[PDB]
Design an enzyme around this catalytic site. Structure first.
Site, PDB file in Angstrom:
ATOM      1  N   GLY A  44       0.813  -1.209   0.000  1.00  0.00           N
ATOM      2  CA  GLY A  44       0.000   0.000   0.000  1.00  0.00           C
ATOM      3  C   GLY A  44       0.848   1.261   0.000  1.00  0.00           C
ATOM      4  O   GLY A  44       2.003   1.238   0.443  1.00  0.00           O
ATOM      5  N   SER A  45       0.291   2.352  -0.530  1.00  0.00           N
ATOM      6  CA  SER A  45       0.853   3.688  -0.301  1.00  0.00           C
ATOM      7  C   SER A  45       0.560   4.111   1.133  1.00  0.00           C
ATOM      8  O   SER A  45      -0.289   3.511   1.790  1.00  0.00           O
ATOM      9  CB  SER A  45       0.243   4.710  -1.259  1.00  0.00           C
ATOM     10  OG  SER A  45       0.741   4.531  -2.565  1.00  0.00           O
ATOM     11  N   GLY A  46       1.258   5.141   1.608  1.00  0.00           N
ATOM     12  CA  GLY A  46       1.103   5.620   2.996  1.00  0.00           C
ATOM     13  C   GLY A  46       2.176   5.169   3.987  1.00  0.00           C
ATOM     14  O   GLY A  46       2.132   5.542   5.172  1.00  0.00           O
ATOM     15  N   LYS A  95       5.560  -8.326   2.537  1.00  0.00           N
ATOM     16  CA  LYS A  95       5.182  -8.115   3.934  1.00  0.00           C
ATOM     17  C   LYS A  95       3.965  -8.949   4.224  1.00  0.00           C
ATOM     18  O   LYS A  95       3.088  -9.076   3.385  1.00  0.00           O
ATOM     19  CB  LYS A  95       4.885  -6.642   4.239  1.00  0.00           C
ATOM     20  CG  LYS A  95       6.115  -5.762   4.230  1.00  0.00           C
ATOM     21  CD  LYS A  95       5.792  -4.345   4.700  1.00  0.00           C
ATOM     22  CE  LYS A  95       4.872  -3.634   3.738  1.00  0.00           C
ATOM     23  NZ  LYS A  95       5.589  -3.260   2.490  1.00  0.00           N
ATOM     24  N   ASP A 100      -1.419  -8.602   0.330  1.00  0.00           N
ATOM     25  CA  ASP A 100      -0.056  -8.675  -0.225  1.00  0.00           C
ATOM     26  C   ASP A 100       0.351 -10.111  -0.534  1.00  0.00           C
ATOM     27  O   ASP A 100       0.903 -10.389  -1.602  1.00  0.00           O
ATOM     28  CB  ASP A 100       0.981  -8.054   0.732  1.00  0.00           C
ATOM     29  CG  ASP A 100       0.776  -6.551   0.958  1.00  0.00           C
ATOM     30  OD1 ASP A 100      -0.305  -6.012   0.645  1.00  0.00           O
ATOM     31  OD2 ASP A 100       1.703  -5.895   1.485  1.00  0.00           O
ATOM     32  N   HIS A 198      -0.720   0.125   9.273  1.00  0.00           N
ATOM     33  CA  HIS A 198      -1.922   0.448   8.518  1.00  0.00           C
ATOM     34  C   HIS A 198      -3.055   0.882   9.454  1.00  0.00           C
ATOM     35  O   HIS A 198      -4.227   0.834   9.068  1.00  0.00           O
ATOM     36  CB  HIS A 198      -2.390  -0.738   7.667  1.00  0.00           C
ATOM     37  CG  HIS A 198      -1.352  -1.270   6.730  1.00  0.00           C
ATOM     38  ND1 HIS A 198      -1.114  -2.617   6.583  1.00  0.00           N
ATOM     39  CD2 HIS A 198      -0.499  -0.641   5.887  1.00  0.00           C
ATOM     40  CE1 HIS A 198      -0.155  -2.797   5.692  1.00  0.00           C
ATOM     41  NE2 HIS A 198       0.239  -1.613   5.257  1.00  0.00           N
TER      42      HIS A 198
END
Lengths: 336, 336
Positions: A44-46, A95, A100, A198
């Protein structure tokens, strides 16, 4: 547009990177680099600079960002891997999140069937919570950065795909991370203890009394939760199939030498991270752990979360040589 | 205690630095370095990594941290300068705040009287406000980092004290900064426009509409407020006295080549700074400005302030050569 503008900004800031379109992924401008194992990650982005900030010589060949806290789709991974393959194979660093795992698995299988030599390394370093919101087992967090550097150095040196994967898997069994948050990306003077990157819940909420006491309990949890047995899946490219392997992590113990990562989750003043490092060294020395190298700063963030994480990775002379080896990326740069 | 612990953490994390006690200041471990002009700066804590993160080969010889947003006392500056002097003199870099000006001036005088060849460079890059809370004239902000590196490179090459100071003063006249904040270290979707790095008020409070629109107006203000006439005081070590000098900054204009610094004021997600940089490049290109090099990250913070600043510094071939020269500090590292 905002994610697109951010990626365009990255590409403009760093001419040594290439931003691909349709589908979107990022590689070294000189990819494919022939003659070396290629390293690929994503997620993910962030969590920036993870992973696009780690693209360059001595680290990742490319990365596949997804939407905010959302796995990249397998087309991105497949096409990125094809673009970076330098004929010595592609190592996918994953990860441990259910999305994922699923997407990288889909891509890995198809890559093998398309004639790319490939295998995988799963990261599950977060000691806090078993079976969190988006994870079967333990979450993959900041130790990914350390493993990407060390396996990056081995690949750059000319190590085979098998040697790089084995190193990755070994380091994963020797790295331990825990994070806390004082505010999401909580009541007054309260922390989410054992938070994920997250926004996942931790072990609990508990009082924040001081920075020193917070580090003490993080450090204690690294030790207390250090022993861990679980099954991980890896791609056997000789057989052309998934292989399960039961593996056990030992806790850190007296005599161990470590690399320490004190990591900003997004909004912690840098001054405070040096205070964290101060307490960490004292607890390490008291437990007979020798910190050999450190990284302090924002290496695996969670947008603008107020908090930090500590990662300790057991190392030896050989891994220290890999640490000291040159790296040239947006987020990590040293050596010739 | 917490300041003490943070400085202890810094010293533990970076053995290339020496933490001095009674009084407290920080130097390169190999200081005094014979044969080279020594560079010294300092200021309040809370702006990290400014200045202790910039101590090392190719940059600062030492730094004098004060209390939070508070100038170091002149004994720290006096003693640091004595420690770092390598027999080629010491250059003091001073951000334009009444406290810093006062304290560095007291130290400079006494240093000269104690036999140390010394002179000074004042930084007043912040275009937003004239005569702020703690400033006569314009505030010294993130362009300090850029000048420290470039003058650092000149000193390391072996340039004389006078050449280093002349370079420093020239760059000060060609560098322009502005910052915004979305939250202090404000109403809904309102920003403090033209904020200072110690939380001083800006031009005004105004709406935040989008990242692109904010960058547009920051960029327009760099251009509109670029012209500036003022008196700056420098130490004449030949006369042994303070000398006033009237100088004028020209605004950036079409044809200029620049180094761009997009700087996290403490709590902006890194991804967002790439979004800032994307828009900055577009406006620069449209205005005939060529961004030759960039830095994007947390280089001059204001504790945990949510916001960012943009700095543009006019450069030529000679200055680019100094940019590209090696630097080896906690916060900036490249080259052999």
């Amino acid at each position: 547009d905002v994610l697109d503008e951010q990626l365009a900004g990255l590409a403009k800031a760093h001419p040594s990177l290439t931003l691909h379109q349709d589908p979107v992924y990022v590689t070294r401008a000189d990819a494919p680099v022939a003659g070396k194992v290629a390293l690929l990650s994503g997620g993910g982005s962030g969590n920036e600079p993870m992973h696009c900030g780690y693209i360059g010589q001595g680290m990742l060949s490319g990365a596949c960002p997804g939407e905010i806290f959302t796995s990249p789709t397998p087309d991105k991974i497949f096409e990125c891997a094809m673009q970076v393959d330098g004929g010595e194979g592609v190592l996918l660093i994953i990860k441990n999140y259910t999305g994922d795992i699923l997407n990288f698995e889909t891509a890995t299988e198809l890559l093998h069937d398309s004639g790319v030599k490939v295998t995988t390394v799963v990261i599950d370093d977060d000691v806090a919570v078993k079976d969190s919101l988006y994870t079967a087992g333990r979450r993959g967090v900041a130790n990914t950065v350390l493993i990407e550097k060390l396996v990056g150095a081995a690949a750059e040196r000319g190590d085979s795909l098998d040697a790089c994967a084995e190193l990755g898997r070994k380091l994963n069994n020797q790295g331990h991370s825990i994070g806390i948050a004082l505010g999401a990306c909580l009541a007054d003077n309260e922390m989410e203890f054992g938070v994920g990157i997250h926004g996942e819940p931790g072990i609990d909420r508990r009082p924040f009394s001081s920075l020193d006491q917070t580090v003490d309990e993080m450090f204690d949890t690294l030790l207390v939760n250090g022993s861990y047995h679980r099954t991980l899946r890896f791609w056997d490219y000789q057989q052309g199939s998934w292989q399960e392997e039961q593996q056990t992590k030992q806790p850190l113990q007296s005599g161990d030498r470590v690399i320490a990562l004190v990591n900003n989750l997004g909004a912690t003043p840098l001054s405070e991270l040096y205070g964290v490092y101060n307490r960490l060294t004292t607890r390490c020395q008291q437990a007979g752990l020798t910190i050999e190298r450190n990284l302090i700063g924002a290496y695996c963030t969670s947008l603008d979360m107020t908090g930090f994480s500590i990662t300790l990775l057991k190392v030896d002379d050989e891994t220290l040589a890999l640490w000291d080896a040159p790296v040239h990326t947006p987020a990590l740069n040293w050596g010739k």
